[PDB]
């Protein structure tokens, strides 16, 4: 694979070549792949086998996960990036208690 | 995503934002997502792409996993929470040998 | 399972018995299994249940993943192996920034 605007990788703190789970709201597909960065603005491109799991225009949610010890886990707040129809970031924040944004 | 009554997260020791495997007894679907806590009692709500993998009323089993060294693993007992039709906890215990509850 | 020419395991730095994600470009299948090495040149053979997820001639992408601390992750470059129609390596390199090869 998933080639993603480097701006969105930066905003979400997802590294190039990081494993991500991608889920497609339109068709319900769920898969794992790794990211590739592109300088081309607004791009979210599914390459290879993943191409069969989406069509242009589909809405996807791209997630990265990490492992924590129990103590660190208690206080960790995930980073969330929201975008507009052009894949431009509109909000970058961290989750608060009870899914608050 | 899965928004879950904070009472059930507390009972199971699953943290908000923890990765969980969710399996649907009605339709056999199996997926991974992360939890969101809600103060609203009895709620188990599938958001986003996961919405396509269940209908209201479906029975689901929600599991979290952890990594252990070999020695710790020998003696670890998972936490199990059973609920009624209203998603109210009816039993909270730990597995004993041979799946005993 | 997946029995793979030891030459390709060597080239990619994937160990025998390592967990791999295999995705099939022809049919979109995605699965995880482990590798078995074979001395037989050019072989990529799906054994067991995985046999139902490909036909001879299908193009597959075989990936291994690893866990890193945040600092090491910043500078890690994955190894990539490209092959010809006979599964002979044509290029072995590491990813550079922005998916450059």
């Amino acid at each position: 694979x998933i080639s993603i605007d480097e701006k969105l990788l930066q905003a979400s703190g997802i590294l190039e070549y990081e494993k991500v789970q991608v889920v497609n709201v339109n068709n319900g597909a769920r898969f794992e792949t790794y990211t590739i960065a592109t300088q081309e603005e607004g791009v979210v491109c599914l390459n290879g086998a993943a191409a069969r799991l989406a069509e242009v225009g589909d809405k996807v949610i791209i997630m990265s996960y990490a492992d924590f010890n129990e103590e660190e886990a208690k206080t960790f707040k995930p980073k969330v990036v929201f975008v507009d129809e052009n894949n431009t970031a509109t909000k970058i924040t961290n989750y608060e208690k009870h899914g608050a944004i | 995503x899965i928004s879950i009554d904070e009472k059930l997260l507390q009972a199971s020791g699953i943290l908000e934002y923890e990765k969980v495997q969710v399996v649907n007894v009605n339709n056999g679907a199996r997926f991974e997502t992360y939890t969101i806590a809600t103060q609203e009692e009895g709620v188990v709500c599938l958001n986003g792409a996961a919405a396509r993998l269940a209908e209201v009323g479906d029975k689901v089993i929600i599991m979290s996993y952890a990594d252990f060294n070999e020695e710790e693993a020998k003696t670890f007992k998972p936490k199990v929470v059973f609920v009624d039709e209203n998603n109210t906890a009816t039993k909270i215990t730990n597995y004993e040998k041979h799946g005993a509850i | 399972x997946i029995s793979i020419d030891e030459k390709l395991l060597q080239a990619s730095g994937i160990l025998e018995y390592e967990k791999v994600q295999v995705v099939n470009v022809n049919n979109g299948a995605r699965f995880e299994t482990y590798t078995i090495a074979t001395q037989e040149e050019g072989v990529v053979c799906l054994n067991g249940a995985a046999a139902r997820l490909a036909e001879v001639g299908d193009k597959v992408i075989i990936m291994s993943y690893a866990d890193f601390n945040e600092e090491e992750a910043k500078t890690f470059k994955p190894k990539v192996v490209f092959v010809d129609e006979n599964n002979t390596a044509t290029k072995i390199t590491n990813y550079e920034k922005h998916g450059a090869i």
Partner: peptide, 25 residues
């Protein structure tokens, strides 16, 4: 010691702009 897995970050509802089956890279 026991490790658990949390969501680290997400990009919510991005739009797919291209889907390239035969990608070489």
């Amino acid at each position: 010691a026991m490790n658990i897995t949390l969501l680290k970050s997400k990009i919510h509802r991005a739009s797919v702009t291209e889907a390239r089956l035969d990608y070489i890279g």
